Amino acid sequence: TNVYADSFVIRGDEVRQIAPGQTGKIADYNYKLPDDFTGCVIAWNSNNL
């Protein structure tokens, strides 16, 4: 029906925090996925960009 692309940049260790239902400072105070979240998660290194 639609697609929301949520784009942002983090450090390498916080990518585990972005799974749905996860907890952590990123997952608690700036960006939290729903518990019943459906969708896909994409993360890729950009130390050269």
Partner 1 sequence: ATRFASVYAWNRKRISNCVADYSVLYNSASFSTFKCYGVSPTKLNDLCF
Partner 2 sequence: LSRLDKVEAEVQIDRLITGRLQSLQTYVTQQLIRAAEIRASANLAATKM
Binding site for partner 2 (CB under 8 A): 21, 23, 35
Residue whose tokens read 């050269």: 48
Using the rule CB under 8 A, which residue among 2, 23, 38, 47 binds partner 1? 23
Which one, of 49, 47, 41, lies nearest residue 15 by Cα?
Answer: 41
Residue closer to partner 1 (CB basis): 25 or 44:
25
When asked if residue 13 is in the footprint of partner 1 (CB under 8 A), the reply is: yes
Contact partner at residue 35 from partner 1, partner 2, none, CB < 5 to 8 Å by partner kind? partner 2
Task: Report d(CA 32, CA 21) in Å as an integer.
Answer: 8
